[PDB]
Design a protein around this ligand. Structure first.
Ligand SMILES: [K+]
Ligand SMILES: [K+]
Ligand SMILES: [K+]
Ligand SMILES: [K+]
Ligand SMILES: [K+]
Ligand SMILES: [K+]
Ligand SMILES: [K+]
Ligand SMILES: [K+]
Ligand SMILES: [K+]
Ligand SMILES: [K+]
Ligand SMILES: [K+]
Ligand SMILES: [K+]
Ligand SMILES: [K+]
Ligand SMILES: [K+]
Ligand SMILES: [Mg+2]
Ligand SMILES: [Mg+2]
Ligand SMILES: [Mg+2]
Ligand SMILES: [Mg+2]
Ligand SMILES: [Mg+2]
Ligand SMILES: [Mg+2]
Ligand SMILES: [Mg+2]
Ligand SMILES: [Mg+2]
Ligand SMILES: [Mg+2]
Ligand SMILES: [Mg+2]
Ligand SMILES: [Mg+2]
Ligand SMILES: [Mg+2]
Ligand SMILES: [Mg+2]
Ligand SMILES: [Mg+2]
Ligand SMILES: [Mg+2]
Ligand SMILES: [Mg+2]
Ligand SMILES: [Mg+2]
Ligand SMILES: [Zn+2]
Ligand SMILES: [Zn+2]
Lengths: 194, 91, 97, 132, 25, 216, 98
RNA sequence: UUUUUUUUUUUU
RNA sequence: GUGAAAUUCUUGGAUUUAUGAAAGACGAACAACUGCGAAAGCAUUUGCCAAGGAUGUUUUCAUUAAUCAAGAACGAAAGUUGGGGGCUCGAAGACGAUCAGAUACCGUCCUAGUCUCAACCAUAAACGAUGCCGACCAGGGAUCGGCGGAUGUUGCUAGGACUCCGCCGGCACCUUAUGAGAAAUCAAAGUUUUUGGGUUCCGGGGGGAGUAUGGUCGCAAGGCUGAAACUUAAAGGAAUUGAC
């Protein structure tokens, strides 16, 4: 159910006689037997986990924390990454560009893995048949196949009904439209081609 | 004998899905099933185990790479950028 | 150039290719220079370096992988490391230091 | 500040384009602005914004303001549009410089700081240029 | 007529003729 | 409201390398709340003529960049932060019917100052020369560039920032480069056209104060 | 009819020459064909030289110079009168005007 | 460098 | 920003000023009647990999050569398929102007494209509108590469830079007719009714027409090959005078 491969990493526990086992989102280029260094003083190499305060501008990172210690929430999908834009030492905040293109300000103590997520280019391949989508979503959730609203009867969809197949009213709906009425293009600022 | 004029690997799909889609998927079909050079042991024995995972049959090293290729184009650019930044920090 | 010196050694001198033969030459003190490629595994490289240190023999890190080292030696197979028992007409031993 | 004859030096960036004239006075670092009068602040029609008379009026206003802030001498940084556009200063550059000289301010170093690309992005207008 | 535009017109006409050809087979 | 009524003036002080210490005056808004005049003035860069610094008009073709490292009282103490030729000087030097040679090198001083140096030179005609051009071959240009790079690297690596600027002031490095390269092709107008600071060491008040005298 | 032996340009023993952009209109024109002029003129015009010198803030100071390389296309050069139409015999003269 | 389109057939 | 304006951005700070960071293009000035390459084309430094002309040669083989149907390699720009990039500029498109109209010329914002990788496309006023090999054929000064000789300097390390005289090869230029040409012009477009050195391609008044059809290549755009019916007394080249 996840495009990106995962990496099992074994650490030595700081203060206990045992092994600390972790599961990281794999960055492209990492291999079995590689040494990973996590910390403020870790070197700037792909696969290392560093605080954003120690990552110079223009760096490509992945699995970026939103709150210090949350252990990573941003740019985790295959082939995705965030870009470090600038630092603000006055308030200790770093600016990042997310995969969607949005610019976000996070505390400079937030951690991030150097490099991009492995498995990029997955969505380029055409699937060519319904069976491939069936297999894809079987391990994700019951969200496939999808029945069009205009193919239903009125009782179960606002788009249902009619002697012809058609919506019959604007497919753009209100942001505050109640559940059951909020279908189609929700709160669309525009429609159609660019 | 030249079994197929131009279909090659996508000949398994017969006459389905359209010529454009068959040609488009030919690239992935060839790349994900081709062998790749292993930098750790110098052998052309790297094969895809699953999307993004590439294992070498000779030395046993497993790497995380592209979905259908061992190394994506952006991977080299990211490595170059990281190396430049690391050199700037270290100097 | 290192590649041309190695070709001269290949054509006119005595050499051994391979990890086992390299270790044998180091043990017997016959080898005079050990060339190790980049592709060589780190543990094997460390062991070869320790052997060369014990035997008081020079070690050179070839600017290439095992495939490149084999191509330079003129063979059709990968060479992880090699030992120069005697340079016939080359002067690698006298030039590298 | 100490002696009457002591010279306090500002920097006058004179941007002389063919559509407007800027006379911007700053400190030596350039991080502090003292006075910025443009040719378009002294005329009514858009076609006279780069006129020598407008440049002279702007320079006179700049000198009058600077004399109150205590600047006695000015370095000159004359620039054109630069980039991939024209490198020729606009008609107002010389009127501004002459007015500054005549307004009792002392003139220091004069430098052309037009941005010169070692090689630029494509210039506008297409490969056939502006056709008239 | 400029020879360039005459050639363009001829190419348009050829495309239209080929489309008419293919319509009827 | 007048914003210049709440601005204080400060005197810029050049390092001990230059003959003249008083560079000029710069102002900043007075401290109010969390806005500090000292932090406002920190790391400001001033471009000053070497002719002004040395009271010698023969050096008017050089521009020196002085950065503000610290503020004490009403004095902003600065230090060398790079140098550049002037546009008019460079345009006058560049001419047709002759060969232009340029080189650059990244070097580090004993003080851990990483800087990039850009040197320029031109081929020179002989007094009895008759042909209308003085063009050096590409191999000769490459050899001259190699000599320039070697000399610049040695000179920069064998000294600190203070002594390097001391060498820059009289243009000793260019003289040595010309002397070394004359064996390949006569050269004229050999100069260190530009110098920029890529990295600087961690700020040290003692190191800053060595080059600044007591102001009291 | 061919009216110029050089074909209006200065390409010999060469396949292609990269173009420049006209300093007036921006039209693309091969460099070997563009009309090139070099202007070296005092920054301060002779009229204002005296006033600027009187306002000089130093005991001695040499006024700088402005250097501009103008590259014109044929149309712009002719229109601006950088070059003029010459007679058949006169257009063979290559020496610059005195 | 604002704008400036058009002139029935033959013949002299 | 323009001839003048407007679309447009602007007290939520536009434009301008200083410092710094990122991204992708582009390699100015030097830069030329200069260089390299079969052509297309090729201009930041350094390293690696092969390749090449000319020069020098009292080195080697000994006719192994010239030009070329068929058949092949490369082949600007635009264009196609799919990734990566996407700063600038910018087909299409949308607005503002001008105008009798203005689907334009001018201005403003922009999609594809412009860059790179993999695979195609194979066409340009792809021009010197001028096939290749060889011989002869006037003069002159420059210039690039190599070589030979002479000579005097160098803030230099026998050499390099410059000076002078020559040879070979190359990009070109000026003068001239004893030459050619319809001339324009050409030192090769000469050595042609005093017609013959070898060899490839290719034209037969102007249109229809690079069209129809067939074949072949291409994903497509289109490329290559390529008519006829019919129509017509001119079309066209160089140069002269006038008019504009
Ligand atoms: K379902
Ligand atoms: K459906
Ligand atoms: K309905
Ligand atoms: K419908
Ligand atoms: K204006
Ligand atoms: K021609
Ligand atoms: K010309
Ligand atoms: K009639
Ligand atoms: K773009
Ligand atoms: K009209
Ligand atoms: K457009
Ligand atoms: K094509
Ligand atoms: K041509
Ligand atoms: K010659
Ligand atoms: Mg329907
Ligand atoms: Mg205006
Ligand atoms: Mg015109
Ligand atoms: Mg020489
Ligand atoms: Mg004509
Ligand atoms: Mg061409
Ligand atoms: Mg008009
Ligand atoms: Mg009409
Ligand atoms: Mg800036
Ligand atoms: Mg350049
Ligand atoms: Mg050259
Ligand atoms: Mg694409
Ligand atoms: Mg734009
Ligand atoms: Mg393209
Ligand atoms: Mg053709
Ligand atoms: Mg020579
Ligand atoms: Mg005919
Ligand atoms: Zn392996
Ligand atoms: Zn023009």
């Amino acid at each position: 159910g996840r495009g990106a491969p995962l990496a099992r990493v074994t650490f030595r526990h700081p203060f206990r006689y045992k092994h600390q086992k972790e599961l990281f989102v794999a960055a492209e280029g990492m291999y079995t037997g590689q040494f990973i260094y996590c910390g403020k003083k870790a070197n700037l190499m792909v696969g290392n986990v560093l605080a954003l305060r120690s990552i110079p501008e223009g760096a490509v990172v992945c699995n970026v924390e939103h709150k210090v210690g949350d252990r990573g929430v941003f740019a985790r999908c295959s082939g995705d990454y965030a870009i470090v834009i600038s630092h603000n030492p006055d308030n200790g905040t770093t600016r990042i560009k997310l995969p969607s293109g949005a610019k976000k300000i996070v505390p400079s103590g937030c951690r991030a893995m150097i490099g991009q997520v492995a498995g990029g280019g997955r969505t380029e391949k055409p699937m060519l048949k319904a069976g491939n989508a069936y297999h894809k979503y079987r391990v994700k959730r019951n969200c496939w196949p999808k029945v069009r609203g205009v193919a239903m009867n009125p009782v179960e969809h606002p788009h249902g009904g009619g002697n012809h197949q058609h919506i019959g009213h604007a497919s753009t709906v209100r942001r505050d439209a109640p559940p059951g009425q909020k279908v189609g293009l929700i709160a669309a600022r525009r429609t159609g081609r660019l | 004998t030249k079994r197929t004029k131009k279909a090659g690997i996508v000949g398994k799909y017969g006459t389905r899905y359209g010529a454009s889609l068959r040609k488009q998927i030919k690239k992935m079909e060839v790349s994900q099933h081709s062998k790749y050079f292993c930098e750790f042991c110098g052998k052309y024995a790297v094969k895809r185990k699953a999307v993004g995972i590439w294992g070498c049959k000779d030395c046993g090293k497993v790497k995380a790479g592209g979905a259908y290729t061992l190394n994506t184009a952006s991977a080299v650019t990211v490595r170059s950028t990281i190396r430049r930044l690391r050199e700037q920090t270290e100097s | 150039s290192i590649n041309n010196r190695l070709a001269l050694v290949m054509k006119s001198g005595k050499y051994s290719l391979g990890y086992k033969t390299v270790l044998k030459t180091l043990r017997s003190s016959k080898g005079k220079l050990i060339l190790i490629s980049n592709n060589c595994p780190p543990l094997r490289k460390s062991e070869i370096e320790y052997y060369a240190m014990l035997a008081k023999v020079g070690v050179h890190h070839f600017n290439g992988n095992n495939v490149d080292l084999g191509t330079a030696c003129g063979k059709y197979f990968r060479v992880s490391c090699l030992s120069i028992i005697d340079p016939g007409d080359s002067d690698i031993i006298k030039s590298l230091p | 500040a100490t002696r009457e004859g002591e010279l306090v030096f500002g920097v006058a960036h004179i941007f002389a384009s063919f559509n407007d004239t800027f006379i911007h006075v700053t400190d030596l670092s350039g991080r502090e602005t003292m006075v910025r009068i443009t040719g378009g602040m002294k005329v009514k029609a858009d076609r006279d914004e780069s006129s020598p008379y407008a440049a002279m009026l702007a320079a006179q206003d700049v000198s009058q303001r600077c004399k109150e802030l205590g600047i006695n001498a000015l370095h000159i940084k004359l620039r054109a549009t630069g980039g991939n556009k024209t490198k020729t200063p606009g008609p107002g550059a010389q009127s501004a410089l002459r007015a500054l000289a005549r307004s009792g301010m002392k003139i220091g170093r004069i430098e052309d700081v037009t941005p010169i690309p070692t090689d630029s992005t494509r210039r506008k207008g297409g490969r056939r240029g502006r056709r008239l | 007529m400029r020879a360039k535009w005459k050639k363009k017109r001829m190419r348009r006409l050829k495309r239209k003729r080929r489309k008419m050809r293919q319509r009827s087979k | 409201a007048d914003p210049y009524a709440k601005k204080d003036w400060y005197d810029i002080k050049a390092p001990s390398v230059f003959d003249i210490k008083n560079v000029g005056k710069t102002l900043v808004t007075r401290t109010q709340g969390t806005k500090i005049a000292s932090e406002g003035l920190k790391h400001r860069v001033f471009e000053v003529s070497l002719a002004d610094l040395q009271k010698d008009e023969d050096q008017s073709f050089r521009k020196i960049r002085l950065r503000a490292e610290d503020v004490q009282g009403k004095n902003v103490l600065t230090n060398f932060w790079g140098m550049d030729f002037t546009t008019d000087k460079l345009r006058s030097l560049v001419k047709k019917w002759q060969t232009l040679i340029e080189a650059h090198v990244d070097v580090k001083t004993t003080d851990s100052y990483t800087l990039r140096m850009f040197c320029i030179a031109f081929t020179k005609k002989r007094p009895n020369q008759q042909k209308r051009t003085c063009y050096a071959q590409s191999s000769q240009i490459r050899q001259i560039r190699r000599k320039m790079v070697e000399i610049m690297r040695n000179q920069a690596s064998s000294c600190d920032l203070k002594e390097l600027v001391a060498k820059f002031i009289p243009e000793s490095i260019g003289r040595e480069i010309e002397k070394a390269t004359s064996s390949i092709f006569p050269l004229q107008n050999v100069y260190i056209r530009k110098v920029k600071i890529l990295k600087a060491p961690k700020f040290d008040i003692g190191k800053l104060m060595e080059v600044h005298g007591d102001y009291s | 009819t061919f009216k110029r032996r050089n074909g209006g340009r200065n390409k010999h023993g060469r396949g292609h020459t990269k173009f420049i952009r006209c300093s007036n209109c921006g039209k693309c024109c091969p460099k070997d064909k563009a009309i090139k002029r070099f202007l070296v003129r005092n920054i301060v015009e002779q009229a204002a030289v005296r006033d600027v010198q009187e306002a000089c803030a130093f005991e001695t100071y040499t006024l700088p110079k402005l250097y501009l390389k103008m590259q014109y296309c044929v149309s712009c050069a002719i229109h601006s009168k950088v070059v003029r139409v010459r007679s058949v015999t006169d257009r063979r003269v290559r020496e610059p005007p005195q």
